[PDB]
Amino acid sequence: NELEEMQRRADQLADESLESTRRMLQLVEESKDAGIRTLVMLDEQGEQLDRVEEGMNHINQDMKEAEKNLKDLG
């Protein structure tokens, strides 16, 4: 009857589950690579942010000096 079809249904669903697992592997691999690139980008942006902050500091110092000179002119 549908016995054969039942067995082949079991095999089929097993296949679907397996290929599903393969898809999982590929997806977590891609996720992994994207994650690494993300981390490196975060590093770059981080160092950039540090240099920007130090830049703001230097701007602050220089502007303080200019402020002093303006108070001298006043």
């Binding site: 095999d11 690494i36 690139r37 981390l39 490196v40 590093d43 770059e44 160092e47 950039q48 240099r51």
Partner: protein
Amino acid sequence: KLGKLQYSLDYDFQNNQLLVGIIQAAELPALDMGGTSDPYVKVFLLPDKKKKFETKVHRKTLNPVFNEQFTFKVPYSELGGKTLVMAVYDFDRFSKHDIIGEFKVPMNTVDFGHVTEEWRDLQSAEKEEQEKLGDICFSLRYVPTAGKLTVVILEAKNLKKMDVGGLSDPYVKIHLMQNGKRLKKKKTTIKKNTLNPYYNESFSFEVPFEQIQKVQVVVTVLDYDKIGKNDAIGKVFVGYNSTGAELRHWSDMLANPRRPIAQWHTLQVEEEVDAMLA
């Protein structure tokens, strides 16, 4: 010279088995003793690592006749993902049995409904460069003005088994070498029980831009053994005497200042790496 091999092929649907027929090979090279050969043929299924069969040995013949048949216990559904390999070995009493020539037949192209039998010219066997040692990814960032070199050990993968009965206990040690001298020894943490360790650990060094082209950076992946000296899994080196992808990464680091460049590197055997170091 390319010899020929006559083979038979048929599938038994009743018992779910593959019938491999070794008839004869023709036009064989004048190897082994001068003027004649002693050829023995080894047949095996490529995906499977099951015990390899070998035909009888024939003494002193360039045109040997085996007329032997083998049976492979293989399901018909899984045969779609298999491939038959026939390799024509040679014989040497006091030497290593050099392989004369092999060839492979994809089972997906074979019609087992009709009895198959074909002549196939042999091809020179492919050679592996080494056992899979592994890869390691890290990023390189260099800023000339400050002279700081930031090496962020990102990760590694496909590392070779070291500890017996176990996978690995990997860690990374970076050596800043110059003039055959080890100067700075920095290492990462130990990631227990893994073949794909994750570090994401930043390191820093002092490197003036006047000496940037005269320094060597040795990234060494090792396995931790609880007792005894920790055996080294592999190692790579960038900088002076660097080749290929390493020199590529170094050049990328130089071409990109104040910016990190993440890259993968294929590990080589410790001996050859130590050899390439002047």
